[PDB]
Design an enzyme around this catalytic site. Structure first.
Site, PDB file in Angstrom:
ATOM      1  CG  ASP A   1     -14.107   2.924   6.255  1.00 12.14           C
ATOM      2  OD1 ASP A   1     -15.349   3.017   6.126  1.00 12.14           O
ATOM      3  OD2 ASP A   1     -13.293   3.123   5.309  1.00 12.14           O
TER       4      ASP A   1
ATOM      5  CE  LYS B   1      -3.757   1.658   3.031  1.00 12.14           C
ATOM      6  NZ  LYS B   1      -4.120   1.347   4.442  1.00 12.14           N
TER       7      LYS B   1
HETATM    8  N1  D15 Z   1     -10.787   0.671   1.816  1.00 15.75           N
HETATM    9  C1  D15 Z   1     -10.044  -0.121   0.858  1.00 15.75           C
HETATM   10  C2  D15 Z   1      -8.873  -0.857   1.486  1.00 15.75           C
HETATM   11  C3  D15 Z   1      -8.256  -1.447   0.245  1.00 15.75           C
HETATM   12  C4  D15 Z   1      -7.492  -2.789   0.284  1.00 15.75           C
HETATM   13  O1  D15 Z   1      -7.889  -3.672  -0.491  1.00 15.75           O
HETATM   14  N2  D15 Z   1      -6.392  -2.933   1.034  1.00 15.75           N
HETATM   15  C5  D15 Z   1      -5.701  -4.107   0.943  1.00 15.75           C
HETATM   16  C6  D15 Z   1      -4.835  -4.376   1.970  1.00 15.75           C
HETATM   17  C7  D15 Z   1      -4.079  -5.547   1.940  1.00 15.75           C
HETATM   18  C8  D15 Z   1      -4.146  -6.488   0.919  1.00 15.75           C
HETATM   19  N3  D15 Z   1      -3.510  -7.659   0.743  1.00 15.75           N
HETATM   20  N4  D15 Z   1      -3.865  -8.171  -0.329  1.00 15.75           N
HETATM   21  C9  D15 Z   1      -4.739  -7.406  -0.960  1.00 15.75           C
HETATM   22  N5  D15 Z   1      -5.278  -7.838  -2.098  1.00 15.75           N
HETATM   23  C10 D15 Z   1      -5.810  -7.037  -3.017  1.00 15.75           C
HETATM   24  O2  D15 Z   1      -5.721  -5.824  -2.959  1.00 15.75           O
HETATM   25  C11 D15 Z   1      -6.558  -7.678  -4.224  1.00 15.75           C
HETATM   26  C12 D15 Z   1      -7.020  -6.878  -5.274  1.00 15.75           C
HETATM   27  C13 D15 Z   1      -7.699  -7.428  -6.364  1.00 15.75           C
HETATM   28  C14 D15 Z   1      -7.946  -8.800  -6.439  1.00 15.75           C
HETATM   29  C15 D15 Z   1      -7.472  -9.575  -5.398  1.00 15.75           C
HETATM   30  C16 D15 Z   1      -6.804  -9.030  -4.302  1.00 15.75           C
HETATM   31  C17 D15 Z   1      -4.997  -6.265  -0.155  1.00 15.75           C
HETATM   32  C18 D15 Z   1      -5.766  -5.063  -0.138  1.00 15.75           C
HETATM   33  C19 D15 Z   1      -7.472  -0.398  -0.519  1.00 15.75           C
HETATM   34  C20 D15 Z   1      -7.671  -0.461  -1.885  1.00 15.75           C
HETATM   35  C21 D15 Z   1      -7.043   0.392  -2.756  1.00 15.75           C
HETATM   36  C22 D15 Z   1      -6.207   1.329  -2.223  1.00 15.75           C
HETATM   37  C23 D15 Z   1      -6.015   1.413  -0.868  1.00 15.75           C
HETATM   38 CL1  D15 Z   1      -4.935   2.679  -0.416  1.00 15.75          CL
HETATM   39  C24 D15 Z   1      -6.649   0.552   0.042  1.00 15.75           C
HETATM   40 CL    CL Z   2      -5.393  -1.383   3.719  1.00 12.98          CL
END
Ligand code: D15
Ligand code: CL
Length: 347
Positions: free
Chosen positions: A153, A54
């Site tokens: 959230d 992230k």
């Molecule tokens: N309120 C939204 C929180 C999500 C989010 O998905 N955070 C994740 C934290 C940790 C994490 N570990 N694996 C993840 N997988 C995916 O993001 C994902 C995306 C698409 C298909 C399968 C998995 C993720 C996602 C998010 C999404 C986009 C940007 C932010 Cl900064 C945070």
């Molecule tokens: Cl996150």
């Protein structure tokens, strides 16, 4: 030029497929965007695994809040019991090109994506029960006294499957979380999942997460948000359609009571007067969860008629749990430990 060309005009890092960071991470691609930044998929050469990074926005207010998130993630990840495995694992964090980067274990799609995949028919009551149980256990963990963490959230997009074909889930996005007694914001929670105490501008505690859970569980079974307000007035009116006018003892102490309600000479409250002719909501308390859930008519929209696992008794238990989670009084709203003892979860 922003951040010497590394950033777009919204403080985000301009992600470039194939880039190698710190002789260690191999960026595959952008996999999501949100208010706090981006999540990219990356291969970690040193540990030899896929990770999610992230990249927080390059802007002081975002950076400073994300630092609270990291402290909380580290505190949760180290706390001893096994319930800690409902929370996403932060592997490490670093600064790169003036962005704070958090490295996470890889997870699959979120509960919203799952619903979309059924065309919003909803998932089965059995699957709903599995998510409910896991979430309450996560909530019990956050309520452990050393942590006392309010997520702030909770919503389908922040609950993720570990494996796209399996029922195990994890909670992400502690970017707005705080500990009890370190509250700093007033307008928090996504609107559909927002609790009455926050709508009303009142002090709030861990009970706000149980409100969100209740909304989430109905949505997962019906396919559709329970309370889908377009703004705060409309969100409170929608809650009122299902649950009635909130009790006098709450409204009497609510700073924003008068944004939505008015006090009658007798000491009772009603919704604020509106233009003559102007009907928009069902009268208070006449939109029954009994009918939304289809307890005696085959489930939401009749779509579960004569299915296994969807008996009237099943639905009555589910409905009771949900109403206990949507109690207006945050002091009597069901707490995680007792929710796990509910007859909805009996073996
Ligand atoms: N309120 C939204 C929180 C999500 C989010 O998905 N955070 C994740 C934290 C940790 C994490 N570990 N694996 C993840 N997988 C995916 O993001 C994902 C995306 C698409 C298909 C399968 C998995 C993720 C996602 C998010 C999404 C986009 C940007 C932010 Cl900064 C945070
Ligand atoms: Cl996150």
């Amino acid at each position: 030029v922003y951040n010497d060309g590394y950033d777009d005009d919204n403080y985000d890092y301009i992600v470039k497929n194939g880039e190698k960071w710190m002789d260690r991470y191999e960026i595959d691609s952008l996999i999501g965007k949100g208010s706090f930044g981006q999540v990219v998929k990356a291969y970690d050469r040193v540990e030899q695994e896929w990770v999610a990074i992230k990249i927080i926005k390059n802007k002081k207010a975002f950076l400073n809040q994300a630092q609270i998130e990291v402290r909380l993630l580290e505190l949760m990840n180290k706390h001893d019991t096994e319930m800690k495995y409902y929370i996403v694992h932060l592997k490490r964090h670093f600064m790169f090109r003036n962005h704070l980067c958090l490295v996470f274990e890889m997870l699959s799609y979120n509960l919203y994506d799952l619903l979309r995949n059924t065309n919003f028919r909803g998932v089965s009551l059995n699957l709903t029960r599995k998510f409910a149980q896991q979430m309450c256990t996560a909530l019990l963990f956050l309520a452990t006294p050393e942590l006392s963490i309010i997520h702030c959230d909770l919503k389908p997009e922040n609950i993720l499957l570990c494996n796209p074909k399996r029922s195990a889930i994890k909670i992400v996005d502690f970017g707005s979380s705080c500990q009890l007694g370190q509250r700093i914001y007033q307008y928090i929670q996504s609107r559909f999942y927002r609790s009455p105490e926050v709508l009303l501008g009142m002090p709030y505690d861990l009970a706000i997460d149980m409100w969100s859970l209740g909304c989430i569980l109905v949505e997962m079974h019906t396919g559709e948000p329970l309370f889908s307000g377009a703004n705060e007035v409309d969100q409170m009116n929608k809650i009122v359609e299902v649950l009635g006018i909130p009790p006098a003892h709450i409204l009497d102490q609510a700073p924003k009571a008068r944004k939505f309600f008015e006090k009658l000479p007798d000491g009772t409250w009603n919704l604020k007067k509106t233009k003559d002719g102007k009907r928009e909501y069902k009268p208070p308390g006449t939109r029954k969860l009994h009918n939304i859930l289809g307890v005696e008519t085959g489930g939401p929209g009749g779509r579960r008629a004569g299915e296994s696992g969807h008996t009237v008794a099943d639905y009555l238990k589910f409905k009771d749990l949900i109403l206990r989670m949507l109690d207006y009084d945050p002091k009597t709203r069901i707490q995680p430990y007792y929710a796990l003892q509910h007859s909805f979860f009996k073996k």
